[PDB]
Amino acid sequence: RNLRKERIGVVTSNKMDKSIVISEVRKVKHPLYGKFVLKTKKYVAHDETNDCNIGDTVRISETRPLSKTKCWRLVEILER
Amino acid sequence: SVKIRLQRHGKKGKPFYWVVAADARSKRDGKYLEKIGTYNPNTNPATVELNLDSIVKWLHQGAQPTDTARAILSYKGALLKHHLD
Amino acid sequence: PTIQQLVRTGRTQITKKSKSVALDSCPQRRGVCTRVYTTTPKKPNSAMRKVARVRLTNGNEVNAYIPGEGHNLQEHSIVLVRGGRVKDLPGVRYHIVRGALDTSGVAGRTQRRSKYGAKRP
Amino acid sequence: GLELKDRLVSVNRVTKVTKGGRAFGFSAIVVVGDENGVVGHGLGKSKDVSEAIAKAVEDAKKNLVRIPLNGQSVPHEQKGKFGGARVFLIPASHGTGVIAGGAVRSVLESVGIHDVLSKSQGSSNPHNVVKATFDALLQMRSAHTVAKQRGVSLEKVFK
Amino acid sequence: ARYTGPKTKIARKFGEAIFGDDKSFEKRNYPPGQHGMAKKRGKKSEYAVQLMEKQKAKYSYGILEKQFRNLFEKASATKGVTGEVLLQLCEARLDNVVFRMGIAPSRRGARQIVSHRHITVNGEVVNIPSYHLKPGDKVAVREKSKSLEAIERSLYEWITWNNDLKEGTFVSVPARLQIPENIKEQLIVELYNK
Amino acid sequence: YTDPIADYLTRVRNAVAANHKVVEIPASNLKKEITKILFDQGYILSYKFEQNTVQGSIKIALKYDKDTKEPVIKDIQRISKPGLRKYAGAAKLPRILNGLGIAIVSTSKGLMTGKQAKQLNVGGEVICYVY
RNA sequence: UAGCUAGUUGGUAAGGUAACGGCUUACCAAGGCCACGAUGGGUAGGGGUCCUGAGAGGGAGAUCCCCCACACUGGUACUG
RNA sequence: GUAAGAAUAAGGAUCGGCUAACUCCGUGCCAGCAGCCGCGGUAAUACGGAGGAUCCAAGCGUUAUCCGGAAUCACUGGGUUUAAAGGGUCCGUAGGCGGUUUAGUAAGUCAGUGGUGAAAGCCCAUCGCUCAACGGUGGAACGGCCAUUGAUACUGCUGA
């Protein structure tokens, strides 16, 4: 295989059918002042039985595009 | 069809060719795949720097040499070596 | 100041407003004159400087200063403005090339011949 | 030293207003150095230029200072302010040259430096920039001096 | 281009005979001009000093400012003493070596003999005066113009010159402590870094 | 506080400026490591780790010459700050005082000097520099 | 320039395309983005690179090479 | 390669200070010059001409657009009593920073390996055009990104 990309994030909202949206925070150094800045990005993952709720810590992996703006799936729910 | 051809890179009056494998649908001295050898027809011996470790590899992969390419690869080897099955 | 303040809003760099603006950022511009007259400096100089109202090819009305002595510069003449203001006439911010299409050069000039458009005697 | 050469940095004409008219006067700054180890600056005030320069060099002949100039130039980088000016001296090589300003060049040529880079990111007053260069040059201590002050051999300060 | 003018004037405006210590160096040694013969300006600026110290070397060899700056920034690529390598590459010129070998007693004659296919360098004839002689070159004289009238008429520590075959075997690149010249390279470096 | 390391350096700098003899700084592992490094490099005379406190004290004796005192600590400043952390591998270490000063670098092995870490080819975070 | 989006956001079945996919259709829910700058306006092809500068940076994207868009102004399909 | 013949070939800018180079003649706040200071009202080293001098050189000056000098937007590398600059004062949201010790992970940080970072271009070294420009070869660089293996001193997270 090839071990497609994987991210770890926090569930932000569950208001859709069989789909969740999580937010991932990363600390990147500023290109000029060299100060580490917390930048956020929101992914859209795929859920089957609607198990995770807002405030959890999930781990998603990149797959084929299952829909528009939806190319991830939750596999490794860690904390609730 | 990937072909083994020559790319002109010298100066005005004195040419200097690179024996390189490239796609036929590309410009002469532009994009290529992998530089193979080097040809300098500025001295009497007509110096060459062929690389028989990749020439036969490209020939097996499906390269198609031209007249000058197959005349440079003639008196430097890799043709009597590509023939051996 | 603070690194956090700089990260939020960095240093603002100004644009350095140019000097010669009404010539479209070209070295020379052709133009036609409409009024050739004379003006006074501010102080304490006392003279009669020769200026001309030139309408450039890009639709700009400027005031050019005629260098040297000796010229025709009628009410309608094709001149070539190059730029370079003077600190005596308020408003004149351009110069006219001597030796251009229609403007005359100078006679009896021998030292600064490259300027004022004078041939070598 | 004994073979002291002088150099006039700047001569400025001053004026004092009185009831009658203007009372002129000349002030001169002269840096005199042995070109090897010692240098000193002085100020002279008079009415004639030659008398002012003579008083300046006679006052600068006193209070000479010794400066370490390891090899051919300064041992390390140093800053000197003395109020208005702000001079920064950095050693370069053994063949670079003295890249200095207007008044710093005379001081660096009179003290005996031949390859250094000095940036004056401050005022342009000859009265203050010479003293700023002096303040930046007197704070320099060589490797032997720092080793003796620490108490460690002269190999741990390098390794 | 070349100077092609009076050399005594150039010697007088610098106070040092660089084209041969001979006639006219004395006898009004003061600089030329109607205002140079009189009491010149006393206060001489450091910029004037550096500029004249550069022009002395720029006039002694016959180099223009363009080529001099090119050679300076070429020699400045060496990590050693910049002025030292500058003077070394300026001395390594072909016409300068021909002048030092005894032939063409002046550099102005060196850059008129070398530019006439009268001298050969390592076999093939080289008629370029700015030719940079690397250490270990063999300079000879063309056999056609070998028995000339001026060559035998006109005929160092690093040049091994042999008069029997017009040899000279340029080797052992000299140093500042060996090249005799009354010029200060540190001033030239400071002027070009100004 | 905002930077105990900055306070530890500031107390020493102020005492040196005021021509004191001993300082009674609070204690911590990082301050003890910095004190050990400084004593090994030869910028302080002696140091004592005083107990009988909830945190503990560090009593450091400052060094001056026996004539023309001229304190050996002329400039002791920080490079990394809690508002801007500056790290560097074993190629971008500073050149404090042209090799005549020390630069403390917290490395993956421990607390070392800028010159003692370049030999080990380890990077780390530059904490402070002393002339 | 503080609200924007209504096939828009997600799902269930079909039609499909070389190929997954609101790409399209039928049905259900109201979702999705936004101060870490949506939306709106002005300008602009992008990069390897060029100039300058001690460096950090700043200013441009000719000629050489790679990618994209276009062929009087617009739309559509066939052959392959 | 052979044969007459120095024959077939030097100009532009500047000269009060910045900035390298000064004397005279004519005009008398006029004509004019000028990048800034600014010169000319009848003894002008600043205007025009002549002589001399300086720089560059088959080029020399002006204009237009850029970088440096400008530490004059400052992370490197500035300030806020009187020169421009502390909000009229508190509370507090988002955010920024974090007293001591200890256990765990290793996200930031550091080190190694593999892949990539096209060619061309800059730099270094070496060869061919009589040298150079130019061209060939090699190295360095491409400060970056992905995967993996280690260290745990400092920051982040969890527990005490």
Side-chain angles (χ1 to χ4, degrees), chain A residues 1-5 7-46 48-55 57-61 63-75 77-80:
Chain A
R1 316 300 272 100
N2 277 112
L3 281 203
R4 280 196 276 255
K5 310 180 183 65
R7 309 297 173 187
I8 302 180
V10 166
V11 177
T12 307
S13 93
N14 295 331
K15 302 298 182 302
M16 295 176 296
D17 305 68
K18 306 184 189 65
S19 69
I20 73 173
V21 175
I22 79 172
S23 307
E24 191 266 340
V25 174
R26 52 189 170 93
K27 305 165 26 66
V28 283
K29 190 183 64 180
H30 206 271
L32 186 58
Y33 308 111
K35 185 179 180 59
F36 296 91
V37 173
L38 269 65
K39 198 174 186 61
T40 186
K41 189 185 190 302
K42 290 190 297 181
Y43 302 92
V44 179
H46 195 19
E48 304 310 274
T49 36
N50 306 145
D51 47 333
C52 63
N53 272 7
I54 307 135
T57 300
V58 297
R59 187 185 203 271
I60 67 176
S61 266
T63 82
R64 91 181 199 279
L66 303 97
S67 148
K68 182 180 187 177
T69 71
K70 184 178 179 182
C71 305
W72 308 81
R73 63 179 169 108
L74 77 90
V75 307
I77 290 186
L78 298 176
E79 198 203 53
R80 294 181 173 271

Side-chain angles (χ1 to χ4, degrees), chain D residues 150-152 156, chain F residues 8 31-32 34-35 37-39 41-47 49 58-63 72-73 76 102 104 113 130:
Chain D
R150 290 204 224 174
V152 296
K156 275 188 53 59
Chain F
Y8 171 89
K31 292 173 187 174
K32 288 167 187 176
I34 298 204
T35 321
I37 291 183
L38 227 62
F39 170 72
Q41 290 297 141
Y43 283 104
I44 54 185
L45 263 170
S46 62
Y47 64 97
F49 294 156
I58 303 178
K59 187 187 306 299
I60 307 174
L62 302 177
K63 165 189 290 188
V72 307
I73 296 185
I76 166 169
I102 66 172
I104 299 184
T113 305
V130 187

Side-chain angles (χ1 to χ4, degrees), chain B residues 39-48 50-51 54 56-61:
Chain B
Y39 176 58
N40 174 83
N42 294 278
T43 78
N44 254 37
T47 81
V48 301
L50 187 272
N51 179 25
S54 80
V56 309
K57 183 253 299 181
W58 281 113
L59 286 173
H60 286 169
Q61 298 298 76

Side-chain angles (χ1 to χ4, degrees), chain D residues 99-108 110-114 116-117 119:
Chain D
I99 305 185
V104 192
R105 174 172 296 271
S106 90
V107 178
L108 297 179
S110 299
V111 65
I113 305 176
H114 299 291
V116 72
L117 327 171
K119 190 61 173 123

Side-chain angles (χ1 to χ4, degrees), chain D residues 75-76 78 91 139 141-143 146 149-152 156-159, chain F residues 41-43 63 65 70-72 74 97-102 115 131:
Chain D
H76 58 259
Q78 191 65 28
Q139 290 190 359
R141 38 177 193 157
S142 57
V146 282
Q149 289 183 14
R150 290 204 224 174
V152 296
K156 275 188 53 59
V157 309
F158 294 161
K159 294 309 85 193
Chain F
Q41 290 297 141
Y43 283 104
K63 165 189 290 188
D65 273 308
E70 226 274 0
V72 307
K74 291 178 172 54
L97 211 54
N98 196 86
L100 303 178
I102 66 172
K115 286 168 291 186
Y131 281 4

